[PDB]
C-alpha cells in the first residue's frame, strides 16, 4: 500500500565525495528529508523542498521541478553516512542508504 518511492536505492562512494538523491514521482506534498542515522534519534536537514534547516551544515541543498525532485549531498564523511529518509506528507521511502568507503 505505497504511493511514495525514492531513487537511487543503495549507493557506494568514498568519504568526501558527492552524490545525488531524488524522490518520486508526482504526488503532491510538503517535501522533506531526515538525516542519516548516527545511532541516536535523527535530525532534520531541510524544509519546504529547498529550505535548509536550522543548525545543519551547509553541505545540504535540494531542488524541485514539479514531479522532478532532486537533492545533492556534497562532502560526505564517515560521521554522516547511514540510513536516511525522504518525507512527502506522511509516508516514507523504500529504505535508501549510503555506505562510506
Amino acid at each position: 500500500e505505497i504511493v511514495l518511492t525514492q531513487s537511487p536505492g543503495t549507493l557506494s562512494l568514498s568519504p568526501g565525495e558527492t552524490a545525488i538523491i531524488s524522490c518520486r514521482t508526482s504526488q503532491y506534498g510538503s517535501l522533506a528529508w531526515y538525516q542519516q542515522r548516527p545511532g541516536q534519534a535523527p535530525r532534520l536537514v531541510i524544509y519546504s523542498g529547498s529550505t535548509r534547516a536550522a543548525g545543519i551544515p551547509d553541505r545540504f541543498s535540494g531542488s524541485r521541478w514539479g514531479p522532478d525532485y532532486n537533492l545533492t549531498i556534497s562532502n560526505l564523511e564517515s560521521g554522516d553516512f547511514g540510513v536516511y529518509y525522504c518525507q512527502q506528507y506522511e509516508f516514507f521511502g523504500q529504505g535508501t542508504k549510503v555506505q562510506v568507503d
Partner: protein
C-alpha cells in the same frame, strides 16, 4: 510635461490589511435588567438602527479564512468576559470534605444517577456543624465499590486542581447575537459570491459597514444555530489532504433536533458562610427517565448522503465510510451541548453508523462540575434548574477528521467526528468580513502649477 507634473489628491481609494481590535454592538433593549455581567453586556452600545451596504463594481479581492486574526481576538475577548462574569458574585467553595452517600430510593425503585447523600457543612456560627441532603451526580464523585466512594468517604472531583467557583444564580445565560463595527479609518469587506473554497479571489464583493449578528454558542462536533448555507452543500476546509487540519461541512437545509431533561426537579438552599449561599438539587418528583434526544432518520440519512456525494467530488474514484467517535475524554467524544444553564453530554455513536454507495434516539448524561474551555483552571459549578427543561436547535454543520495510515486505489476512506479547538466553532460563520485599513494619501504625477 509642464512642471513635470508633481501633485497630490486628497483621499484616493486604497487599502491594506492591518491587525486591530474590534468593537461591541448588541441590541440594548431587554438586558438593562442584567446588571451583573453577561455576554451581550448592557453597556456595549445600542445597535445601528439602519444597517447599510453597497455592491462595489469590479472589485477584485482575495479572502482568506485561516490567515485572518479577528477570530483570535474573539477567542481572547469572550474568555476574558467569562472570567469577568465569574469574578464577582462567586462564592469560593470550602467543599470537598469527608462525606457519605447511598442509593437514592426516591420511589421504592432506585434512581439511575442521583444518590440521596448526607452532608455536614459549617453552620452560620463557625463552631458548629449540621447535616443536610446535598449534591450527588455520579460523574462528579471519585468512586469505590465499598460502603463509600473514593478510597473511603468521598470528595468532589475538583479538589486536586483548583477552587471551583459558584455561578451567580441571578446571572442568566442565553446566546443572543452580537455585531462588530470597526472604528473610523477601518472598514469591512464581504464576499457575496458562492461556492467559495475559503481562499482565492472572490468576485461578487460588497462592502458592509458592520458585521451581521452571530450567536457564539459553544459546542463540539455539531454546529447548531449557525446560519444556513447559501445553496446546496459546501466544504469550507483549508486543504483536504492536510489531515491534521479539521474539515468543516456546512448545510443549506436545516434538520430539527430536540433534547429534554424530562424529570421535575427543585433546588434547596444551603448556607456555607456568613452570607454565602450554596445550591444543589433538593428533590425529584414524578416519572424517572434519562435525558435523551430525538431525531428523524430520513432527513439525517438524506443529509449524510448529500454530504457524501458532494465531498466525493474532491476524489476521482474513492468511496467513504463513517465511524463512531475517536476516543479520549468525554468532553470531545460526546456531543457537548448547552441549553438554559444545564449541560448535556450525548453519545454520538448512533449518528455515524451509516455508509455511502424512522426516529433515532440518543442517550445523554448531565454534568455539573464543568472543566470548561482550557481545562487548566477557572472551573465553574452551575446551579440546577427547577422543573423540566426542553431545548431545540437547527443542526447546521459537522467537524470531520480524515484519519490517515496507508492507502491504495480502490480502498475505503474513513472520516470520524471530533470537536477540539473551540475556535472552530466561530470560524464557521465569521469566514467573511476581512478587516482592512484605508490610507487616504494617494498620489500620482499630474500637470499643474501653483502660480
Amino acid at each position: 510635461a509642464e512642471n513635470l507634473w508633481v501633485t497630490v489628491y486628497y483621499g484616493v481609494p486604497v487599502w491594506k490589511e492591518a491587525k486591530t481590535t474590534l468593537f461591541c454592538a448588541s441590541d440594548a433593549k431587554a438586558y438593562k435588567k442584567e446588571v451583573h455581567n453577561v455576554w451581550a453586556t448592557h453597556a456595549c452600545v445600542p445597535t445601528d438602527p439602519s444597517p447599510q451596504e453597497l455592491f462595489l463594481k469590479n472589485v477584485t479581492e482575495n479572502f482568506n479564512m485561516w490567515k485572518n486574526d479577528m477570530v483570535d481576538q474573539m477567542h481572547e475577548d469572550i474568555i476574558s468576559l467569562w472570567d469577568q462574569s465569574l469574578k464577582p458574585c462567586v462564592k469560593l467553595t470550602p467543599l470537598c470534605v469527608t462525606l457519605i452517600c447511598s442509593n437514592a430510593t426516591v420511589k421504592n425503585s432506585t434512581v439511575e444517577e442521583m444518590k440521596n447523600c448526607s452532608f455536614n457543612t459549617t453552620t452560620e456560627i463557625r463552631d458548629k456543624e449540621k447535616k443536610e441532603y446535598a449534591l450527588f451526580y455520579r460523574p462528579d464523585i471519585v468512586p469505590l465499590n465499598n460502603e463509600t466512594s473514593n478510597t473511603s468517604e468521598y470528595r468532589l472531583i475538583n479538589c486536586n486542581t483548583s477552587a471551583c467557583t459558584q455561578a451567580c444564580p441571578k446571572v442568566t445565560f442565553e446566546p443572543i447575537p452580537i455585531h462588530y463595527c470597526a472604528p473610523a479609518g477601518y472598514a469591512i469587506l464581504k464576499c457575496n459570491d458562492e461556492t467559495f473554497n475559503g481562499t482565492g479571489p472572490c468576485s461578487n464583493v460588497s462592502t458592509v459597514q458592520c458585521t451581521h449578528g452571530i450567536r457564539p454558542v459553544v459546542s463540539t462536533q455539531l454546529l447548531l444555530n449557525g446560519s444556513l448555507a447559501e445553496k446546496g452543500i459546501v466544504i469550507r476546509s483549508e486543504n483536504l489532504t492536510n489531515n491534521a487540519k479539521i474539515i468543516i461541512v456546512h448545510l443549506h437545509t436545516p434538520v430539527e433536533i430536540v433534547c429534554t431533561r424530562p424529570n421535575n426537579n427543585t433546588r434547596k438552599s444551603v448556607r456555607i458562610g456568613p452570607g454565602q449561599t450554596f445550591y444543589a438539587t433538593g428533590d425529584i418528583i414524578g416519572d424517572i427517565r434519562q435525558a435523551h434526544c430525538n431525531i428523524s432518520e430520513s432527513k439525517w440519512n438524506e443529509t449524510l448522503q448529500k454530504v457524501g456525494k458532494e465531498l466525493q467530488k474532491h476524489f476521482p474514484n474513492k468511496t467513504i465510510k463513517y465511524a463512531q467517535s475517536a476516543g479520549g475524554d468525554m468532553e470531545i467524544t460526546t456531543h457537548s451541548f448547552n441549553c438554559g444553564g444545564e449541560f448535556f453530554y450525548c453519545n454520538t455513536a448512533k449518528l455515524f453508523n451509516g455508509t455511502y454507495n424512522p426516529t433515532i434516539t440518543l442517550q445523554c448524561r448531565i454534568k455539573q462540575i464543568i472543566n470548561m474551555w482550557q481545562g487548566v483552571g477557572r472551573c465553574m459549578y452551575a446551579p440546577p434548574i427547577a422543573g423540566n427543561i426542553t431545548c431545540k436547535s437547527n443542526i447546521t454543520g459537522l467537524l470531520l477528521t480524515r484519519d490517515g495510515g496507508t492507502n491504495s486505489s480502490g480502498k475505503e476512506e474513513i472520516f470520524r467526528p471530533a470537536g477540539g479547538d473551540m475556535r472552530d466553532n466561530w470560524r464557521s460563520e465569521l469566514y467573511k468580513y476581512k478587516v482592512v485599513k484605508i490610507e487616504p494619501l494617494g498620489v500620482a504625477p499630474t500637470r499643474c502649477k501653483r502660480r
